[PDB]
């Protein structure tokens, strides 16, 4: 089927055309009509299978049907376990609403609380917020208009339960209304606890729908960027995909690499969907180049036959990253080597790697030979305002992602050396980041 065969408003149709997706996916084709009808639906759709747009489009349709002013109510609420997923969903919502006149915003853990409170007071008709900060905004912020909750959707309930927000989810359900609220949810899988949570939230009888060496390098925090740059320079003429934990960091790294006179491609949620698809196709068909992508962007995206898979930043979903290699080896003609960067304080991930029992190899590099571009990077940052701002934004995003990592036992902000990270980013003086240390 196609989006043209649905009762979609003209601005929504124009936005969908701007996205570039005209053929409905199986999950989308099966979920969009029931969602538009208002029936509660839950499923085990895999992440990145287009379910995000699948349940976003009905929300926009409901908003366009009600046509209530931004001051009237809060409209739709979206809960996601991770900050990166929240940013991706907000970007998708903004892309879809470009034509639409409704308001949208985010509430992300570790962000400016005052700004989020002001935005909520102004009125947001499409809110995407993590449960941890969503509870705080619901409880200790006067003027919130959550009383008009029309729809509620939960993404990746299994991850939310695993992190430990089940009590937070119960509190949110208790606080939020249930009179006219239509409840839905989606996740890669669903356990007994997830089923109980769905039963608690989903008011009616919900509709059910179903559808290699672990190479790692131990490098210092300050020298990680230089080592990655040297690896890319000496591995040129190949195809390499780099995984990061922040879209801002990906954009900054891509811009810096382009400025250093070496072609590089970026793939982040903040990029326009049409531009995202064009860049992905160009990288796939080029047969040579380097792609810098975020974890969430490549979570469900197709993986061409790439020679290397580099996990520069800690994975957002450790289990998915651990299990990826098994299928990645079979899915590529030439088994793409997997590379991971581990801080000396991040050696705890070796315990999980051993628990996986997959083959592993410890690569080594000489400290004598390195790109040695620290002085040039510092001069460029101190001389260029745009590059300085991009680097600062990337550093802030990386710190925020690190602080929000579920694996607290392996990753901790306290153990991190801020000075070394700033030097790697090119800042002799680490810019301040509002991290709840």
């Amino acid at each position: 089927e196609k989006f043209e065969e649905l009762k979609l408003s003209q601005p929504t149709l124009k936005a969908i055309e701007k996205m570039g997706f005209t053929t409905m996916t199986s999950v989308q084709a099966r979920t969009i009509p029931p969602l538009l009808a208002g029936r509660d639906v839950l499923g085990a759709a895999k992440t990145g299978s287009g379910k995000t747009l699948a349940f976003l489009i009905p929300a926009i349709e409901l908003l366009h049907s009600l046509k209530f002013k931004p001051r009237n109510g809060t409209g739709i609420i979206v809960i996601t376990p991770t900050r990166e997923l929240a940013l991706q969903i907000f970007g998708v919502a903004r892309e879809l609403m470009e034509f639409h006149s409704q308001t949208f915003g985010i509430v992300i853990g570790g962000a400016n609380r005052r700004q989020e409170a002001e935005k909520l007071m102004k009125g947001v008709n499409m809110l995407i917020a993590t449960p941890g900060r969503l509870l705080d905004h619901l409880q200790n912020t006067k003027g919130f208009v959550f009383k008009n909750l029309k729809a509620l959707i939960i993404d990746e309930a299994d991850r939310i339960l695993e992190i430990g927000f089940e009590d937070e989810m119960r509190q949110i359900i208790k606080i939020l209304p249930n009179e006219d609220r239509q409840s839905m949810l989606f996740s890669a899988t669903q356990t007994t606890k997830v089923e109980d949570l769905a039963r608690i939230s989903l008011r009616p009888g919900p509709l059910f729908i179903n559808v290699l060496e672990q190479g790692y390098v131990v490098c210092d925090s300050d020298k990680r960027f230089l080592l990655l740059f040297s690896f890319l320079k000496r591995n040129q003429k190949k195809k390499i995909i780099v995984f990061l934990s922040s879209c801002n960091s990906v954009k900054y790294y891509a811009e810096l690499l382009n400025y250093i006179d070496l072609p590089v491609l970026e793939l982040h949620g903040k990029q326009k969907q049409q531009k995202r698809t064009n860049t992905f196709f160009e990288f796939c068909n080029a047969e040579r180049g380097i792609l810098i992508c975020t974890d969430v962007a490549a979570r469900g995206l197709d993986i061409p036959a790439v020679d290397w898979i580099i996990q520069f930043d800690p994975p957002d979903d450790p289990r998915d990253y651990i299990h990826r290699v098994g299928r990645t080896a079979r899915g590529t003609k030439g088994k793409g080597k997997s590379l991971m960067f581990l801080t000396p304080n991040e050696l705890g991930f070796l315990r999980y790697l051993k628990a996986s029992k997959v083959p592993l190899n410890e690569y080594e590099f000489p400290e004598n030979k390195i790109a040695n571009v620290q002085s040039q990077l510092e001069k460029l940052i101190k001389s260029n305002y745009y590059l300085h701002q991009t680097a600062k934004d990337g550093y802030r995003s990386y710190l925020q992602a690190y602080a929000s990592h579920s694996l607290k036992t392996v990753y901790q902000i306290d153990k991190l050396d801020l000075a070394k990270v700033a030097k790697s980013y090119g800042f002799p003086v680490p810019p301040k980041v509002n991290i709840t240390i």
Binding site: K382, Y385, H388, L418, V429, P430, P431, K432
Partner: protein
Amino acid sequence: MPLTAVPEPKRRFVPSKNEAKRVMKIVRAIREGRIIPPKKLKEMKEKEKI
């Protein structure tokens, strides 16, 4: 870590604008026949004093 972020302004990474304003004011004064350029002053004084 420092105390306050205070994102840096462009003026820190950009040449001073007050200096440009003063230079433009001096240019306007010279054009209006109000300020003698230093070279003109030197030329006039060289003829003078003798």
